[PDB]
């Protein structure tokens, strides 16, 4: 009955690229939960272990994964917020529609006027999302999370749709009250997913301990301006300002002490 935090990260499979990096906070006592999206694309100095050519370069976050595993991903987003963080999940793309399956499907809306497909470019994603309400497998639900439009605007969509896939998957694990339910579900993900988190007999019901976190999901982007580096690709400088209530916000939900400067690796303006 404690406040954590857990950095979740989606991974093309443990190296491989990051796809996704949710900081996720859970506060039993104020009955919360917090999603914050970081992008990706964010210029940082990366931190890792000193063994590490990567230590101490300027780069995008999505390459402290692709150098050091989950450990430098860990390291690089600690610095990052000013917080210490407690644990990490990495799932990949079988475990995640594993775990959609594993509860049960989820409830989606295509927004366009058009059914979702990524064939055309992944052939071994060749679901399909029809446009409207419709409930949802895990084949299905990897796909609507993987939807680039290939648009400085891509992102900041593909990562609301990530989100909400989390959220919904949340939502149906609340309403679990078997400890077997949540022993089949973590059965069901067992080779595509790995944390520091202790699996046991021991801990899948002292998990259930903060199930009530979930009943109140908010979810959030740290987000700034697109720019342009010199091979033509993109990255984002952070405005200090989003910064700090960003470290604030979460500070806040973990129970910590509100910040009066701004101490991080990411690149600000100034």
Known sequence: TKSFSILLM??????????????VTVNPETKKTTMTSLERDILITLSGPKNNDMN??????????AAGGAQMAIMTVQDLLNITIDNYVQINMQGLIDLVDAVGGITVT????????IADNEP????????GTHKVNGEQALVYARMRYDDPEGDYGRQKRQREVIQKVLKKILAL?????????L????????????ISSNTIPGLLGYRDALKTIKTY??????ATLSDGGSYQIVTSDHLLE???????????????????????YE
């Open 187 to 198: 059965s069901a993900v067992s080779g595509n997913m790995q944390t520091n988190i202790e």
């Open 110 to 117: 295509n927004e366009f006027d058009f059914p979702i497909s």
């Open 10 to 23: 989606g991974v093309d499979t443990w190296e491989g690229n990051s796809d996704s990096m949710i900081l």
């Open 221 to 226: 982007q740290l987000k700034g301006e697109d």
């Open 124 to 131: 071994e994603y060749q679901a399909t999302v029809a446009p």
């Open 246 to 268: 960003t470290q604030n916000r979460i500070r806040g939900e973990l129970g910590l002490r509100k910040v009066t400067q701004l101490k991080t690796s990411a690149t600000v």
């Open 56 to 65: 101490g370069a300027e780069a995008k976050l999505n390459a402290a994964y």
């Open 177 to 185: 009250d078997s400890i077997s339910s949540y022993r089949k579900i």
